[PDB]
Amino acid sequence: PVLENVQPNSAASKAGLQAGDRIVKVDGQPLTQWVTFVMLVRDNPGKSLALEIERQGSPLSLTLIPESKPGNGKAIGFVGIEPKVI
């Protein structure tokens, strides 16, 4: 759960996230599946998510508040994160 990149002017940028950050915990829970993070974002626009990350081996606590996009019939949360390349 290593971010490939963070878009400027995004919720993730506001949270202080950067390319290369590893998401370790979400709301005090270990992040063991990338899809959990994706779902937390999509389903919780406007909610404050407490992140524990590792950045160059060191721990940081950050606050992420997904922004919204219209979706298609139901607005979704959106953070501006490019997932790791596959």
- Domain positions in the chain are 1-86
Inter-residue contact 47 to 79 (CB < 8 Å): no
d(CA 66, CA 32) in angstroms, rounded, equals 20
Specified resolution (Å) = 1.0
Which of 1, 7, 3 lies closest to 67, judged by CA?
A: 7
φ, ψ of residue 37 to 5 degrees: the values are -65, -45
d(CA 21, CA 55) in angstroms, rounded, equals 5
H helical segments located in the chain: 11-15, 34-43
Experimental method: X-ray
CATH 3.30.2320.80, applies to 1-86? no
Inter-residue contact 24 to 31 (CB < 8 Å): yes
